[PDB]
Every structure is written in structure tokens, then in C-alpha cells.
Amino acid sequence: SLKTYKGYLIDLDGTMYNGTEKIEEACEFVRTLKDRGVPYLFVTNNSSRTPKQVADKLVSFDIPATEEQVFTTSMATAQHIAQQKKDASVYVIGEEGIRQAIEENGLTFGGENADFVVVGIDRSITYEKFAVGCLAIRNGARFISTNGDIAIPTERGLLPGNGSLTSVLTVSTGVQPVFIGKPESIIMEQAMRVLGTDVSETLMVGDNYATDIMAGINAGMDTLLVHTGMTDDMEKPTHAIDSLTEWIPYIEGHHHH
């Protein structure tokens, strides 16, 4: 049997969009959801880019995405914090994405005495930036990291990822951070708040097991793994396909005109 899903979370971080064929396939997949009135969000562990930046790029490939249909770990982070304390102050390490999310969720920026410390990727990192974060934590700040990814694949090779930079604070202070992004469930839970659907009716679509699928599994939601081209104690994705095109008939069969 195939369940009827009322909402889709679609991962942006994998190889699912590599090359002309894949991009066109993703376009037809998303247009099917839109055509059939099914709500979706694009999700990402990238804390640096703003939802406008991400949606603009999707739209440049004719993939239909408003700014409101992009949900980043920065947004999950700020929502999480606002739900802890509506008027929280936050010392932020990171780039434009996380700063905008903090701003837009009614939170304020602080320093050595902030309520929270947040670490998101910062290619302009400095010793003093680490230092202020450490001091804030030792002064009692709750410690949050947007995402634990250890490295970023580039043409140069594998560069330091946010998980590696986060570690400076973890080690120096002895305080373990709350990670927001994949494979943790928080990003999924915060996404569902925006999407407006239940765990039982939401599908997470991704192309990497360790991050995308595990995030869905940890949140208790069904998953769809796309093999772009598994130990027994390892929980399988609910569904698996080679191309997003394969899922189109299932959308159409469950969401009619």
C-alpha cells in the first residue's frame, strides 16, 4: 500500500540536481506537486544562504519556489530559539542566512552575556569570534549549532564544515551543543510547523541516507531515498527510487484534479 502524503520536504543538499537531466527531472517532480496542489518546502543544512538567494536560484532553473517555500536550518534555529524564549538575545557566529533568521524571528543580537550562542558556517571566522562565544557559554548561554557537517566538498577538496568550527566552542567550554540540522529531528519538526502537516502525512525526499533519510527517521516521518548513481540493524527508507520522475505517477494517483 502507498500512503497519501499531504506535504513534502525536499532536500537541496545532495547530488539530486547534478546536470541537465537531473535538474529537468526535479523540475517536473516539483511542478507535479504544484500542479496537484500539494504543499512543499525545500530544506537545507546550509545556514549561510538566505531563502531569497536559494529560491532565486531554483527559479532560474524553472523549479517553482517562492522565498516562503525555502526552509533552511538557520530558520529552524531561530524558530527553535524563539520557542525557548521569545525575547532571547543571541551571540551569532555565522553569515547572512543565520543573521537574517535571527532578525526575522523577533530575537536580538548579543555578546558575552547573551542568552544563546549559535554557530553557523563563517568563512570570516576569527579568534575573537570564538572567544566571545566561549565567554558567553561560560557565563551561562545555551549553545546551539546550525549543523554538524564536518566538511564541505568543493573542487579544492574537503573544506572545514560547520561541525568542525562548532567544535572549538565544545572543546574549549566542555559544553555539548544542541545541533539543529540534519540528521537531527529539530530541522524536520520546525519545517513541519511551517508546512502545516503531521509527521504521519509528511514525506522527506532526499538522496543521502546518513543525513537526509536519518533526519526523517529521527523525526518519525516516512522517507523517500533517491539513488542518483545497509546493515541489518539499519532502518530502511520507506521508499526508494532512481529518478524523481518515478514518483510522479504516485503523486498524480493520490492528488487529483
CA 175 to chain centre: 23
Strand partners, 90: 109, 116
Catalytic residue among 13, 122, 207, 222: 13
By C-alpha distance, which of 184, 171, 180 is closest to 210?
Answer: 184
Kindly state the greatest CA–CA separation across the chain: 58
Phi, psi of 42, rounded to the nearest 5 degrees? -90, 130
Grid coordinates representing 241 are 527510487
Catalytic residue among 11, 149, 207, 212: 11
Dihedral angle sign, alpha carbons of residues 121, 96, 203, 198: positive
Residues near 87 by Cβ (< 8 Å), separated by ≥ 6? 106, 107, 108
Instruction: Note whether 190 and 79 are within 8 A (CB).
Output: yes
- Structural method: X-ray
Angstrom resolution of this structure = 1.6
Domains of the chain: residue spans and CATH: 1-84+181-257 (3.40.50.1000), 85-180 (3.40.50.1000)
Residue 130: C-alpha distances to residues 77, 106, 163 (Å) = 19, 24, 14
For 109-120, letters b (16+ CB in 10 Å) and e give ebebebbbbbbb
**Residue owning grid cell 526523517:** 216
Q: Rounded to an integer, what distance in angstroms lies between the CA atom of residue 108 and that of residue 87?
A: 7
CA 46 to chain centre: 7
Dihedral angle sign, alpha carbons of residues 233, 162, 135, 77: negative
**Residue owning grid cell 530575537:** 107
Grid coordinates representing 102 are 535571527
Instruction: Note whether 239 and 225 are within 8 A (CB).
Output: yes
By C-alpha distance, which of 27, 37, 29 is closest to 244?
Answer: 29
Q: Rounded to an integer, what distance in angstroms lies between the CA atom of residue 188 and that of residue 113?
A: 30
Strands 151-154 and 157-160: what pairing? antiparallel
Measure CA of the first residue to CA of the last residue in the chain; give whole Å: 22
The 3-class secondary structure across the chain, one letter per residue, is CCCCCCEEEEECCCCCCCHHHHHHHHHHHHHHHHHCCCCEEEEECCCCCCHHHHHHHHHHCCCCCCHHHEEEHHHHHHHHHHHHCCCCEEEEECCHHHHHHHHHCCCEECCCCCCEEEECCCCCCCHHHHHHHHHHHHCCCEEEECCCCCEEEECCEEEECHHHHHHHHHHHHCCCCEECCCCCCHHHHHHHHHHCCCHHHEEEEECCHHHHHHHHHHHCCEEEEECCCCCCCCCCCCEEECCHHHHHHHHHHHCCC
Grid coordinates representing 5 are 502524503
- Quick count: other Cβ atoms within 10 Å of Cβ 224? 26
Strand partners, 117: 91, 143
Catalytic, 35? Answer no
Residue 129: C-alpha distances to residues 56, 135, 169 (Å) = 31, 10, 10
